[PDB]
Amino acid sequence: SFSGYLKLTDNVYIKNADIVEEAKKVKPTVVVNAANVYLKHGGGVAGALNKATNNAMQVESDDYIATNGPLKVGGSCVLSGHNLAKHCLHVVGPNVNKGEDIQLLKSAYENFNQHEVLLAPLLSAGIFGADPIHSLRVCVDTVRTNVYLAVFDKNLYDKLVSSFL
Ligand SMILES: O=C(Nc1ccccc1)Nc1cccnc1
Numbered sequence: 001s002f003s004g005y006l007k008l009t010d011n012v013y014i015k016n017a018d019i020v021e022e023a024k025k026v027k028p029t030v031v032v033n034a035a036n037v038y039l040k041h042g043g044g045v046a047g048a049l050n051k052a053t054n055n056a057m058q059v060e061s062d063d064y065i066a067t068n069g070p071l072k073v074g075g076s077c078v079l080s081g082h083n084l085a086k087h088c089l090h091v092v093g094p095n096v097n098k099g100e101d102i103q104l105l106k107s108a109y110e111n112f113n114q115h116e117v118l119l120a121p122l123l124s125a126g127i128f129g130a131d132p133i134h135s136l137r138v139c140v141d142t143v144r145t146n147v148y149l150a151v152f153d154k155n156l157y158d159k160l161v162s163s164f165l
Pocket residue numbers: 018019020021044045048049051052152
C-alpha cells in the first residue's frame with residue numbers, strides 16, 4: 001500500500017512524490033488527474049499521467065469528449081487508469097490563470113467523496129494558479145474519504161507541511 005505519507009488529518013495524507021511514480025508503484029484503485037474540461041492532458045500532472053500511459057489516456061479521453069462533450073469546471077469523470085491505476089478520476093479544478101472561479105475548488109474536491117481511497121494531486125495548484133495552501137485547506141475540509149496527496153515540488157511540500165493548521 002501507500003508508504004512514507006505524513007498524516008495531516010484522520011483521512012488526508014501527504015507525500016513529496018511524483019504522482020506517476022506513486023501510481024506505478026502502488027497501482028491504486030483510483031488515481032486523480034488534474035484535468036481541464038476538454039480532457040486535453042498537455043502539461044502538469046495531466047501531461048505527466050498521460051505520458052506515462054504512452055498517450056492511451058489522451059486517446060480514451062478524446063473518445064469520451066467526442067461522445068459526452070466537455071466536463072464542467074468542478075466536475076469529474078471516471079475513466080481507465082491504464083498502467084497507473086484501476087481507474088483515473090479526471091477532476092476539473094478552477095484554473096485561475098485561465099480566469100476561472102476559485103470558489104469551484106470545493107465542488108471539485110467533492111468528487112473525491114465518491115471513492116473510498118484515492119491517490120491525488122492538489123487541485124488547482126501548480127500551473128492552475130491557485131494558492132496550494134488554500135487547495136490543501138479546501139481538501140482537508142471537503143474530502144471525507146482516504147486521500148493520499150502526492151506533491152511533486154519539494155519546496156512546496158515543505159511549505160505545505162510547515163504551514164498546515
Ligand atoms: O513527468 C512526471 N513523471 C513521469 C512521467 C512519465 C513517466 C515517468 C515519470 N512527473 C510529473 C508530475 C507532475 C508534474 N510534472 C511532471
